[PDB]
Amino acid sequence: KVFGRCELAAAMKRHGLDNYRGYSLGNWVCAAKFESNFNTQATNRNTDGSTDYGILQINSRWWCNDGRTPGSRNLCNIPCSALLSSDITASVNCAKKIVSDGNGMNAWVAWRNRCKGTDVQAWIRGCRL
Numbered sequence: 570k571v572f573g574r575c576e577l578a579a580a581m582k583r584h585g586l587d588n589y590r591g592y593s594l595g596n597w598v599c600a601a602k603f604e605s606n607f608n609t610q611a612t613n614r615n616t617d618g619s620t621d622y623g624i625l626q627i628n629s630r631w632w633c634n635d636g637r638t639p640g641s642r643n644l645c646n647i648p649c650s651a652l653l654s655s656d657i658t659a660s661v662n663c664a665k666k667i668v669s670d671g672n673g674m675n676a677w678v679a680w681r682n683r684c685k686g687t688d689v690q691a692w693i694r695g696c697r698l
């Protein structure tokens with residue numbers, strides 16, 4: 570599924586991301602835009618052989634099982650295919666574990682390089698929340 574901007578903001582808010590670990594909703598929308606272009610089916614392979622999955626590009630080295638990342642962990646206790654669903658529940662629940670792991674949203678490279686220190690409230694402007 571390719572979400573609209575305000576449709577995703579509303580889904581993230583219902584699942585408890587607004588101000589989760591102090592990160593306002595626009596941070597989460599900005600990260601999804603630059604990680605996946607709001608597409609739940611996005612995948613990207615990394616040089617180490619791991620793969621990033623779904624709207625928040627969650628990596629198979631630590632967070633999910635894909636059967637093809639040797640020596641990896643599965644800290645979200647999910648198959649990586651669950652992160653590609655039109656229902657963002659599994660992605661949000663796993664993201665809450667990642668952002669709690671000590672480095673905050675710096676775990677997402679596109680957030681650090683394209684969202685951090687910018688006017689992130691612009692990503693939710695005009696939405697009926």
Ligand SMILES: [Cl-]
Nearest residue numbers: 573574602607
């Ligand atoms: Cl947009």
Ligand SMILES: [Cl-]
Nearest residue numbers: 580656657658
């Ligand atoms: Cl959803």
Ligand SMILES: [Cl-]
Nearest residue numbers: 678679682683
């Ligand atoms: Cl980047």
Ligand code: NA
Nearest residue numbers: 629633641642
């Ligand atoms: Na894994």
